[PDB]
Amino acid sequence: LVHVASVEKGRSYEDFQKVYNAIALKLREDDEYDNYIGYGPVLVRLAWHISGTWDKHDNTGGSYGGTYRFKKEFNDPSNAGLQNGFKFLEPIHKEFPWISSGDLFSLGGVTAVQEMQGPKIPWRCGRVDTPEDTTPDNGRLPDADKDAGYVRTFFQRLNMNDREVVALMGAHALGKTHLKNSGYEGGGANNVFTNEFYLNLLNEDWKLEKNDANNEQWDSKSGYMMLPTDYSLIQDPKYLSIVKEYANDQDKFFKDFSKAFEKLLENGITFPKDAPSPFIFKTLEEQGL
Ligand code: HEM
Ligand SMILES: Nc1cccc(N)n1
16 A cells, blocks of 8 residues: 655645644634643644554555544544544634645644644645545554553554654653543643653652542652553663653754654655655744744
């Protein structure tokens, strides 16, 4: 299965910057969401979940086809709550109806990371909507009540190695868990992208508790939480080393997250040798907007 990137006809960097800016301005405007977290974190999670269906073995799933728009995938229990991100993006899509769905969902995550003061994430256009029959079945996204060996095996399907896994999970500095979505509750409610995930893992005093859904999670007295799969990153000695690295080097974390997150968003896509180079969007702040 080959998915060849095809640039939306006649579009260039300055078209996609406009879309980025519309997303970014709406992120600033719609600030009340989720007790004043705003939509940044949910957009990052949307971009990940639309990408994380990918299977390297047969090139099924992935961001290219925009298949989250279809009910089988929209309704995946693993995607509960992401409808809020889709609803955020609907006026953006109405303004810019020429962008493909996969391009919009992936660009929403890039825009969110950058506007939350995270790294620059180079981004490539040309995902093409594919039909409803190409929608992957539910069950391809990961469970949270598992251990490091589970996490490591899971991510091999996505062609991610230990460093890439640990870097990607730093996104768990953002937003929160919600009991009614996933059966986990709590988190920093943070809407600034930092390396805090790693510092919290190493620094807090964690206790293994049960939540009101009868699931185990790690809680800190400071009011933070970790999923079992997050905590596994300090139980496994290989992950632990990388957690320490990122807890001690903000810039390295930023660079490695950027590389892994673009990768994630590009898995499954064949870019022609003459395709445009990746775009690096300016933030609103860099534009004086
Ligand atoms: C083993 C891998 C992972 C597991 C098991 C996992 C699981 C979860 C769960 C259970 C939630 C809470 C959802 C809710 O209740 O609303 C969540 C939230 C979140 N996840 Fe992950 N995740 C994983 C990897 C990732 C990766 C790779 C990223 C992106 C790079 C990511 C980004 C997010 C973000 C940003 C949120 C917060 C959403 C919000 O505040 O609404 N996750 N994740
Ligand atoms: N904010 C957040 C989201 C997912 C998992 C964790 N540990 N925390």
